[PDB]
Design a protein around this motif. Structure first.
Motif, short mmCIF file in Angstrom:
data_model
loop_
_atom_site.label_atom_id
_atom_site.label_comp_id
_atom_site.label_asym_id
_atom_site.label_seq_id
_atom_site.Cartn_x
_atom_site.Cartn_y
_atom_site.Cartn_z
N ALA A 1 0.82 -1.21 0.00
CA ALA A 1 0.00 0.00 0.00
C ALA A 1 0.86 1.27 0.00
CB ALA A 1 -0.95 -0.01 1.20
N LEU A 2 0.76 2.04 -1.08
CA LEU A 2 1.46 3.30 -1.23
C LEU A 2 0.59 4.47 -0.78
CD1 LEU A 2 3.04 2.66 -4.74
CD2 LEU A 2 4.15 2.53 -2.51
N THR A 3 1.23 5.43 -0.12
CA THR A 3 0.58 6.68 0.25
C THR A 3 0.34 7.50 -1.01
OG1 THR A 3 2.65 7.91 0.64
CG2 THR A 3 1.72 6.72 2.50
N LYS A 4 -0.49 8.53 -0.88
CA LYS A 4 -0.74 9.43 -2.00
C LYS A 4 0.56 10.09 -2.46
CE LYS A 4 -2.64 12.34 -4.85
NZ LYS A 4 -2.53 12.07 -6.31
N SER A 5 1.39 10.50 -1.51
CA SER A 5 2.66 11.16 -1.81
C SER A 5 3.64 10.23 -2.54
CB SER A 5 3.28 11.70 -0.52
OG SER A 5 4.59 12.15 -0.75
N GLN A 6 3.64 8.96 -2.14
CA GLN A 6 4.47 7.94 -2.77
C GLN A 6 4.02 7.66 -4.20
OE1 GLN A 6 4.33 4.64 -0.05
NE2 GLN A 6 6.13 5.29 1.12
N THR A 7 2.71 7.59 -4.40
CA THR A 7 2.11 7.39 -5.72
C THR A 7 2.38 8.58 -6.65
OG1 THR A 7 0.36 5.81 -5.10
CG2 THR A 7 -0.10 7.26 -6.96
N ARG A 9 4.92 10.58 -6.42
CA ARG A 9 6.35 10.57 -6.68
C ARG A 9 6.70 9.58 -7.78
NH1 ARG A 9 11.05 12.62 -8.01
NH2 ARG A 9 12.81 11.27 -7.41
N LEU A 10 6.10 8.39 -7.74
CA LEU A 10 6.33 7.39 -8.78
C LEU A 10 5.75 7.82 -10.13
CD1 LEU A 10 5.77 3.97 -6.93
CD2 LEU A 10 7.89 5.28 -7.29
N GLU A 26 10.96 3.26 -6.67
CA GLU A 26 11.58 4.55 -6.94
C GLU A 26 13.00 4.40 -7.49
OE1 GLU A 26 12.74 7.18 -3.73
OE2 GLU A 26 11.98 8.93 -4.81
N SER A 27 13.78 3.49 -6.91
CA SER A 27 15.17 3.29 -7.35
C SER A 27 15.22 2.81 -8.80
CB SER A 27 15.89 2.30 -6.44
OG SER A 27 16.09 2.85 -5.16
N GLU A 28 14.37 1.84 -9.12
CA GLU A 28 14.24 1.35 -10.49
C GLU A 28 13.93 2.47 -11.46
OE1 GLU A 28 14.86 -0.99 -12.46
OE2 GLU A 28 13.12 -1.85 -13.49
N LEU A 29 12.92 3.26 -11.14
CA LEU A 29 12.50 4.36 -12.02
C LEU A 29 13.57 5.44 -12.13
CD1 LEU A 29 8.72 4.69 -11.18
CD2 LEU A 29 9.84 3.50 -13.07
#
Lengths: 253, 253
Positions: A1-7, A9-10, A26-29
Motif C-alpha cells: 500500500a502506497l501513500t498518496k505522496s508515494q504514488t 512521486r512514482l 523509486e530506485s528502479e525508475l
C-alpha cells in the motif's frame, strides 16, 4: 500500500512506455530516467519544444510563409481592441502593458503593414511564448493568409498538410470563440489542438484590415503531448521540473 | 533644409548599405525598402533573430551542450537569491513573480539537478527572452560548463570558437559585475557583446552548486547589430516597427 505522496512521486518518474516496496520502485525508475537523460546527452541534446518550433518553422517557411518575431510584452490597449473586456487571465506588466495571451494582435499589425509591400497573397506565421493566468506559460503557433485563396477549403487543406507532416491524427468540429466568433476546432480526441478562423470578421476594422483572411492557432505543448503520449501537459512545457518529458528531480523522496 | 521629423523619417528608411526634396528622398527609400521585403518574401523568409537562434543552437548542440528551455516567468525570490536587492529594472508579474532579467538562476537549478544524472563535465545552454525595465525586451544566450575543464583558458577558447563561427571580431577585457563579481567582458569596439565568468563564486552556495564552473552570456540583438552593421539596436529586436532591420512603416510621412 502506497501513500498518496508515494504514488505521486512514482507517477512523476514514470514514462509512457514503462510497463513491491516504494523505495525499490523509486530506485528502479530513477535508474531508468537517469539513463534516459544520459542517452539524450550522449546522442541528440535537443529540447523537444525547441526542436518542434524548428520543425514547424521549416514547414511554413518552405510553404511560403514569412517568419515573424514580435514583442511578447505588448500594450494592454491591444487586448481592449481585441474586445477582451477573460480579462482576469491577463498578466499585467508595468501599467500599460501585459504579457500577450495570443499572437493575433501583433500579426494583425504585420498584415496591415506588409500589405504596403508584399504581393498577393500575404502569408505570415509566428511561433512563441503566450500567457494566461490561472498552462499559464505556453507556446503558440499562428499562421495566417490575407488576400486571395482565403477559403475554408484552403485553410483546412493547410491544417491537414501540417498535421500530416507532424503525423498527428485529427478531426475538425464547428465551434465558437467569444473573441473571433465562429471557429473550426482541430480536435485530437477530446483535446483541442487548434482553433481556426475563416475571415473576415467585424473585429478587422479595429485593426485596419480590409481583405479576406484565414488563420489558425496551435498550442505546441499540446502537439508534444499528443506526439509523445504525455498524460500531463506539464511534461511538454518550459520547466525546471521536466526535460523532454523526463523528471529533473532525481533525488530520493 | 529638412526638419528634425523629416530627418528621423528618412533615417528609419535608410539602410547601412544605402549611399533634394524630402518627398522625393522618402519615395526613393520607400521603393528600396519595399523591394527589400519583396526579395526576403520571395527568397528566404527567415527572421534574423530566429535564424541566429537556430544557428547558435546548432553550434552548441554540436559541441556537446544540452539545449535548455526554461520558464521566462520566474519567481521573484530567484532574483533575491541572486543578490539583486537593479531591483528597479525588474518587471514584476502577479505578486510573487517577474520576467527573468537573466538566464543564470534557471540554469543554476538545471546544473544542480542534472548533476544527479549526467557524466562529467556537464554542459548546457539556453537561448531566449529576458527583460529589463527602462532594450527592455531582448534575447540572451547563456552557456555554462560544470566539473572538469572549467578554466579561464577553456572559457576563452569556447568564446573564440563561437565568435569565429559567427565571423565576429572581438577582444576580451577584465571587468566586474555587481552580481557575479570579477568578469571577462567580450568587446566589439565599445560595444559589450558578452560577460563571462570563471567560477566558482560565493553565490554558488545559495544555489546548491559545489563544483567549479564557467559560463558566458551573449545578447543576440547585439550580435545582429554587429553582424549587420545596424546603427540602432532596435533594428535587431522583436518589433512591429522593423523586420530584419527594414522599417515596416512604409506609409508616407
Amino acid at each position: 500500500a502506497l501513500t498518496k505522496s508515494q504514488t505521486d512521486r512514482l507517477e512523476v518518474l514514470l514514462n509512457p512506455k514503462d510497463e513491491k516496496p516504494f523505495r525499490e520502485l523509486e530506485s528502479e525508475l530513477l535508474s531508468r530516467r537517469k539513463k534516459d537523460l544520459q542517452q539524450i546527452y550522449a546522442e541528440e541534446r535537443e529540447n523537444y519544444l525547441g526542436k518542434l518550433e524548428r520543425e514547424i518553422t521549416r514547414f511554413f517557411v518552405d510553404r511560403g510563409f514569412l517568419e515573424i518575431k514580435s514583442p511578447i510584452l505588448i500594450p494592454l490597449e491591444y487586448i481592449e481592441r481585441m474586445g477582451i473586456d477573460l480579462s482576469k487571465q491577463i498578466f499585467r506588466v508595468d501599467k500599460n502593458f501585459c504579457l500577450r495571451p495570443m499572437l493575433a494582435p501583433n500579426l494583425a499589425n504585420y498584415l496591415r503593414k506588409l500589405d504596403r509591400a508584399l504581393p498577393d497573397p500575404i502569408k505570415i506565421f509566428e511561433i512563441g511564448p503566450c500567457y494566461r493566468k490561472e498552462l499559464e506559460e505556453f507556446t503558440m503557433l499562428n499562421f495566417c493568409q490575407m488576400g486571395s485563396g482565403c477559403t475554408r477549403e484552403n485553410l483546412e487543406s493547410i491544417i491537414t498538410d501540417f498535421l500530416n507532416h507532424l503525423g498527428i491524427d485529427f478531426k475538425i468540429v464547428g465551434d465558437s470563440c467569444m473573441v473571433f466568433g465562429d471557429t473550426l476546432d482541430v480536435m485530437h480526441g477530446d483535446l483541442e489542438l487548434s482553433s481556426a478562423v475563416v475571415g473576415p470578421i467585424p473585429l478587422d476594422r479595429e485593426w485596419g484590415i480590409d481583405k479576406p483572411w484565414i488563420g489558425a492557432g496551435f498550442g505546441l505543448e499540446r502537439l508534444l503531448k499528443v506526439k509523445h503520449d504525455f498524460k500531463n501537459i506539464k511534461r511538454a512545457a518550459r520547466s525546471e521540473s521536466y526535460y523532454n518529458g523526463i523528471s529533473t528531480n532525481l533525488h530520493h523522496h
